Design a protein around this motif. Structure first.
Motif, PDB file in Angstrom:
ATOM      1  N   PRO A 146       0.783  -1.246   0.038  1.00 21.24           N
ATOM      2  CA  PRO A 146      -0.038   0.043   0.008  1.00 21.24           C
ATOM      3  C   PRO A 146       0.924   1.282   0.031  1.00 21.24           C
ATOM      4  O   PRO A 146       0.302   2.337  -0.520  1.00 21.24           O
ATOM      5  CB  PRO A 146      -0.968  -0.170   1.232  1.00 21.24           C
ATOM      6  N   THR A 147       2.042   1.076   0.428  1.00 25.96           N
ATOM      7  CA  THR A 147       2.822   2.267   0.672  1.00 25.96           C
ATOM      8  C   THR A 147       3.598   2.522  -0.832  1.00 25.96           C
ATOM      9  O   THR A 147       3.480   3.577  -1.398  1.00 25.96           O
ATOM     10  CB  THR A 147       4.160   2.261   1.573  1.00 25.96           C
ATOM     11  N   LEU A 148       4.020   1.388  -1.579  1.00 26.81           N
ATOM     12  CA  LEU A 148       4.559   1.428  -2.859  1.00 26.81           C
ATOM     13  C   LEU A 148       3.414   1.960  -3.806  1.00 26.81           C
ATOM     14  O   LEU A 148       3.640   2.521  -4.932  1.00 26.81           O
ATOM     15  CB  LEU A 148       4.958   0.280  -3.234  1.00 26.81           C
ATOM     16  N   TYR A 149       2.208   1.362  -3.564  1.00 24.31           N
ATOM     17  CA  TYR A 149       0.984   1.762  -4.341  1.00 24.31           C
ATOM     18  C   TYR A 149       0.932   3.357  -4.813  1.00 24.31           C
ATOM     19  O   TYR A 149       0.422   3.513  -5.987  1.00 24.31           O
ATOM     20  CB  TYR A 149      -0.409   1.254  -3.720  1.00 24.31           C
ATOM     21  N   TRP A 150       1.113   4.208  -3.966  1.00 23.86           N
ATOM     22  CA  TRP A 150       1.198   5.812  -4.195  1.00 23.86           C
ATOM     23  C   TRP A 150       2.294   6.142  -5.501  1.00 23.86           C
ATOM     24  O   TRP A 150       1.789   7.133  -6.057  1.00 23.86           O
ATOM     25  CB  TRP A 150       1.458   6.458  -2.882  1.00 23.86           C
ATOM     26  N   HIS A 151       3.321   5.321  -5.555  1.00 25.05           N
ATOM     27  CA  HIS A 151       4.115   5.512  -6.750  1.00 25.05           C
ATOM     28  C   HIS A 151       3.762   4.644  -7.886  1.00 25.05           C
ATOM     29  O   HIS A 151       4.120   5.262  -9.105  1.00 25.05           O
ATOM     30  CB  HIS A 151       5.573   5.044  -6.118  1.00 25.05           C
ATOM     31  N   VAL A 152       3.768   3.660  -7.746  1.00 27.46           N
ATOM     32  CA  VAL A 152       3.306   2.775  -8.808  1.00 27.46           C
ATOM     33  C   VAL A 152       2.049   1.860  -8.525  1.00 27.46           C
ATOM     34  O   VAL A 152       2.345   0.970  -7.678  1.00 27.46           O
ATOM     35  CB  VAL A 152       4.549   2.037  -9.417  1.00 27.46           C
ATOM     36  N   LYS A 153       0.827   1.984  -9.201  1.00 25.53           N
ATOM     37  CA  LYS A 153      -0.265   1.441  -8.998  1.00 25.53           C
ATOM     38  C   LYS A 153      -0.557   0.189  -9.162  1.00 25.53           C
ATOM     39  O   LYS A 153      -1.267  -0.693  -8.631  1.00 25.53           O
ATOM     40  CB  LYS A 153      -1.383   2.182  -9.414  1.00 25.53           C
ATOM     41  N   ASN A 154       0.687  -0.426 -10.205  1.00 19.85           N
ATOM     42  CA  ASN A 154       0.473  -1.832 -10.660  1.00 19.85           C
ATOM     43  C   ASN A 154       1.559  -2.122 -11.340  1.00 19.85           C
ATOM     44  O   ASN A 154       2.616  -1.077 -11.918  1.00 19.85           O
ATOM     45  CB  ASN A 154      -0.758  -2.360 -11.271  1.00 19.85           C
ATOM     46  N   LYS A 155       1.926  -3.246 -11.884  1.00 18.97           N
ATOM     47  CA  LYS A 155       3.275  -3.726 -12.694  1.00 18.97           C
ATOM     48  C   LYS A 155       3.216  -2.766 -13.823  1.00 18.97           C
ATOM     49  O   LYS A 155       4.438  -2.496 -14.352  1.00 18.97           O
ATOM     50  CB  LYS A 155       3.355  -5.226 -12.836  1.00 18.97           C
ATOM     51  N   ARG A 156       2.335  -2.766 -14.651  1.00 21.39           N
ATOM     52  CA  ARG A 156       2.268  -2.076 -16.049  1.00 21.39           C
ATOM     53  C   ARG A 156       2.661  -0.517 -15.548  1.00 21.39           C
ATOM     54  O   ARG A 156       3.392  -0.027 -16.467  1.00 21.39           O
ATOM     55  CB  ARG A 156       0.963  -1.977 -16.695  1.00 21.39           C
ATOM     56  N   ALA A 157       2.133  -0.004 -14.657  1.00 23.30           N
ATOM     57  CA  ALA A 157       2.523   1.478 -14.122  1.00 23.30           C
ATOM     58  C   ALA A 157       4.168   1.439 -14.002  1.00 23.30           C
ATOM     59  O   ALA A 157       4.735   2.602 -14.313  1.00 23.30           O
ATOM     60  CB  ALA A 157       1.900   1.957 -13.105  1.00 23.30           C
ATOM     61  N   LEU A 158       4.521   0.409 -13.134  1.00 25.12           N
ATOM     62  CA  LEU A 158       5.992   0.163 -12.873  1.00 25.12           C
ATOM     63  C   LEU A 158       6.726   0.041 -14.348  1.00 25.12           C
ATOM     64  O   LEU A 158       7.734   0.957 -14.265  1.00 25.12           O
ATOM     65  CB  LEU A 158       6.087  -0.839 -11.967  1.00 25.12           C
TER      66      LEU A 158
END
Lengths: 194, 194
Positions: free
Chosen positions: B38-50
């Motif tokens: 949930p902390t990482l989520y704010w940066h990259v919402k999913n793998k494709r966004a990553l």
């Protein structure tokens, strides 16, 4: 019956459309086939071998412009070969990603050799023939990767860029593909000049 | 400190080289960062966004020929832009696969617009400029996908095909890449004629 390779690959192609390249695994394919992994192993030793077999089979099934037609010019042969390739790669989910890096299979050695000989017979050096075929393969692959990823998706750009995006996306890259294909043919004509 | 985007992406780039595109997951990246999802989520919402963020960052860090140099011709600009792109895509594992389908980021809008304007100023129609840039992007991407997959690998071909494979593989597709790049430039010159 015995598990045969055609049965393995046909089931794998189905699974590829259902789950995508990343999602596709030999465990899942074994489940689909109702066999265990050591049994599937004899057909596909690992995922990369599975993907290679998918790539080869997709071309065998759907890429039909692999030789020049009677009386076809080298220009028309490259154009139609590229179009045939592009459509074959678009047939399956992640078709472009699956294809990248694969070699012709044994059933494609004959026609791959004939392509090269054909271009040499047209006046290309062998090196120029290899590079010409690479130009079509690589550009087509890049074109398909781009459209498949844009489609697979399920913001204020500057104005020329906004038009650019619309020009590429509005027909899934078809017009751009045709244009570049003629660009490549014209540049190769120029190579044959000198 | 706070987790910042640069820290996320720099760690992700490391992980990409360590495990590859398929292996890269937000769970693993969270572990590497010592945060929860949930902390990482704010940066990259999913793998494709990553993966989109990786693609954009790789160009920002390594693709430097994004504008024409003072006095550079459009021909030299496309040639050097393509070379710069190819080298940037080769910097990271699965760099080609990662890049496919991504758009310019906000930090690249300015230079992407200027590229288009530059080509128009050279005498290209906007449509021709969009297609010319696509030709370089797609061919380069296809070239890189091919070499990365061949490298990533860890048989009696007919004779012309045996020479073909050696010609493409012996320098990781460099000579073929240069040849086609000049083919494309010459064909575009031909387009500007009419």
């Amino acid at each position: 019956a015995k598990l045969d390779k055609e049965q393995v690959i046909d089931n794998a192609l189905i699974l590829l459309n259902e789950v995508g390249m990343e999602g596709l695994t030999t465990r899942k394919l074994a489940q689909k086939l109702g066999v265990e992994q050591p049994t599937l192993y004899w057909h596909v030793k690992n995922k990369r071998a599975l993907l290679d077999a998918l790539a080869e089979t997709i071309l065998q099934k759907h890429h039909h412009h692999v030789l020049p037609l009677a009386n076809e010019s080298w220009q028309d042969f490259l154009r139609n070969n590229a179009k045939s390739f592009r459509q074959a790669l678009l047939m399956y989910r992640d078709g472009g990603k699956i294809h990248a890096g694969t070699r012709p299979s044994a059933n494609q050695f004959e026609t791959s050799e004939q392509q090269l000989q054909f271009l040499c017979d047209a006046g290309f050096t062998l090196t120029q023939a290899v590079y010409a075929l690479s130009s079509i393969a690589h550009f087509t692959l890049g074109s398909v990767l781009e459209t498949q990823e844009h489609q697979e998706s399920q913001i204020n750009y500057p104005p020329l860029l906004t038009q650019a995006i619309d020009i590429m996306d509005s027909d899934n890259g078809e017009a751009a593909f045709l244009f570049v294909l003629d660009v490549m043919i014209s540049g190769l004509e120029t190579v044959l000049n000198n």
